DNA sequence: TTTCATTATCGGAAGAGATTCAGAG
RNA sequence: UCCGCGGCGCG
DNA sequence: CTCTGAATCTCTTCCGACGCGCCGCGAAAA
């Protein structure tokens, strides 16, 4: 029922939301056309986790994924986004998993 | 100058210039050579008990 | 090829794609 | 040097430029482990450019 | 049967390949 | 400012 | 009756004088 086992080193059982089937499905078909996938969710731990879940639902290889953060809508921002990017942070992700 | 390519590619003359030197060297018809070259099929380099 | 970008809010996406 | 600051060029320049574009595109695609479909398509395009 | 928080809604000729027809066993 | 193309005419 | 080899067809590949005046065009990028 919980979807997590406190007695087995916190192994969990995530599963797509009963109302996001379409959303997740469209990314899977669209993923082949895209060369390099850019996860641009919020920099906080919740956003970081959404990025982590996307990466594990779309599959592929780590190198095919990149993490970018958009400052503002201004071109002086959407540009710098792909300029000095990075990848997802595990510590941040695990912090959110701990809270959840 | 020179350019170094990520993946090799054939030289057009040795295929289109009839008779195809490549095909007759390989004892394979040119049609198949074209199909594999432009990535329409696969060909077996090595097969043992397969 | 084409790059795939993913954000959280749809409204924000439409704005980024622009 | 054409009049008005423009230029007249041989087609060879266009062919070489297209080949360079395809080659650099292929390498930048390859170095990040893209799905096989697009890499094969771009390899085919590069072969076409060479031809 | 059942509880939590989070995110955001031309024509002509030659050559090569493929197909078919006739002769043999 | 060196090139190519399109048309026209001369033999 | 069934297969193999040669002929026949279909598809592909080349190549169609040589000089020389004119004319007016070619390309843009953020």
Report, in angstroms and rounded to the nearest whole number, the Rg of chain A calculated over CA atoms.
15
Residue A37: phi and psi, rounded to 5, are: -85, 125
CA distance C17 to chain D (A): 22
Residues B22, A96: Cα–Cα separation, whole Å: 60
**CB of C1 less than 8 A from some CB of D:** yes
Terminal C-alpha separation, chain D: 29
**CB of D29 less than 8 A from some CB of C:** yes
Q: Compute the residue count for chain A.
A: 100
Q: Tokens 């990314």, residue?
A: A27
The pair of three-digit structure tokens given for residue D17, joined into one six-digit string: 């430029």
Nucleotide closest to residue D2 (CA–C1'): F1
Nucleotide closest to residue C10 (CA–C1'): E9
- Tell me the CB-side half-sphere exposure of residue B43, using CA atoms within 13 A: 13
**CA D18 to C1' G27, whole Å:** 17
């Amino acid at each position: 029922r919980m979807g997590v086992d406190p007695w087995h080193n916190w192994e969990a059982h995530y599963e797509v939301l009963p109302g996001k089937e379409k959303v997740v499905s469209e990314l899977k078909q669209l993923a082949e056309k895209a060369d390099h996938i850019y996860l641009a969710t919020d920099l906080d731990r919740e956003g970081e986790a959404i990025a982590w879940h996307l990466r594990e639902v779309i599959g592929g290889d780590d190198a095919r994924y990149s993490r970018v953060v958009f400052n503002e809508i201004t071109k002086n921002a959407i540009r710098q986004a792909f300029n000095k990017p990075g990848e997802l942070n595990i510590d941040r992700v695990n912090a959110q998993q701990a809270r959840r | 100058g020179h350019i170094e390519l990520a993946s090799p590619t054939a030289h057009i003359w040795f295929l289109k210039s009839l008779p195809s030197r490549i095909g007759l060297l390989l004892d394979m018809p040119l049609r198949d050579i074209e199909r594999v070259l432009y990535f329409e099929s696969y060909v077996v380099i090595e097969g043992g008990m397969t | 090829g084409k790059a795939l970008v993913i954000v959280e809010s749809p409204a924000k996406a439409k704005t980024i794609n622009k | 040097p054409l009049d008005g600051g423009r230029f007249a060029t041989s087609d060879l320049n266009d062919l070489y430029r297209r080949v360079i574009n395809r080659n650099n595109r292929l390498k930048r695609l390859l170095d990040l482990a893209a799905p096989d479909i697009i890499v094969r398509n771009e390899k085919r395009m590069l072969q076409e450019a060479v031809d």
